[PDB]
Amino acid sequence: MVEINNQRKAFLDMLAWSEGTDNGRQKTRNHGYDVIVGGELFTDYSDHPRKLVTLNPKLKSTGAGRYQLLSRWWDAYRKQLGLKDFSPKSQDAVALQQIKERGALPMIDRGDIRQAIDRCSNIWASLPGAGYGQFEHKADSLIAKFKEAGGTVR
Numbered sequence: 001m002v003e004i005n006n007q008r009k010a011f012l013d014m015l016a017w018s019e020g021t022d023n024g025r026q027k028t029r030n031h032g033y034d035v036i037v038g039g040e041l042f043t044d045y046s047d048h049p050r051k052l053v054t055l056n057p058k059l060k061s062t063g064a065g066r067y068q069l070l071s072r073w074w075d076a077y078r079k080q081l082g083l084k085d086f087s088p089k090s091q092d093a094v095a096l097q098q099i100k101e102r103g104a105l106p107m108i109d110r111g112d113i114r115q116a117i118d119r120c121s122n123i124w125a126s127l128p129g130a131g132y133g134q135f136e137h138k139a140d141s142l143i144a145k146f147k148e149a150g151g152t153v154r
């Protein structure tokens, strides 16, 4: 289980917004922690909502929780990290493990957020360079939200 410092807490929020779960527009009972992709919400946190949301006629997603974690990885990480519930706690746990895996923790820790975002581009589609054909936020606007999550850059 990864230690949460503020750079990481911010990379998370930045992701929550990039991902649009904690972006102010999206309705939510917690902070995107109950947000399912597509916008609907879940109220039971003992586990991932595992709700397959049909976004458009040609595309679907399991992405849920703050960092729009595909359930695939949720299972991977909750088992890897012995996460009991899908509490926001467990949701962060995962986000950070992936982040750590992208070897972007030293980057997040040290503010090389473009480098982290680009390093984490394969983790979240809303990030630039991700290449998931999803709406990719300009790197500049992610850095921006990140900064407003409390994160520090450069």
Ligand SMILES: CC(=O)N[C@@H]1[C@@H](O)[C@H](O[C@@H]2O[C@H](CO)[C@@H](O[C@@H]3O[C@H](CO)[C@@H](O[C@@H]4O[C@H](CO)[C@@H](O[C@@H]5O[C@H](CO)[C@@H](O[C@@H]6O[C@H](CO)[C@@H](O)[C@H](O)[C@H]6NC(C)=O)[C@H](O)[C@H]5NC(C)=O)[C@H](O)[C@H]4NC(C)=O)[C@H](O)[C@H]3NC(C)=O)[C@H](O)[C@H]2NC(C)=O)[C@@H](CO)O[C@H]1O
Pocket (backbone or CB within 6 Å): 067, 068, 069, 070, 073, 076, 077, 098, 100, 101, 102, 103, 122, 123, 124, 125, 126, 132, 134
């Ligand atoms: C349809 C559609 O459009 N869907 C989109 C959806 O896909 C998007 O969601 C994102 O998807 C991508 C792609 O599926 C996901 O990306 C994957 O993310 C996982 C992270 O959870 C990655 O898995 C990890 O990969 C790393 C490799 O970089 C693994 O780490 C390595 O583990 C090995 C152990 O096996 C370590 O090796 C050992 O190392 C030691 C020293 O440490 C050495 O001494 C030993 O000898 C050595 N042992 C061996 C056997 O070699 C190694 O150190 C370590 N490396 C690092 C840096 O950690 C890690 O184990 C993997 N964990 C799991 C779990 O598999 C996966 O690689 C990555 N794939 C790609 C292609 O990037 C992404 O997670 C997902 N995000 C979300 C939120 O779900 C979304 C995004 O918005 O859009 C949809 O549209």
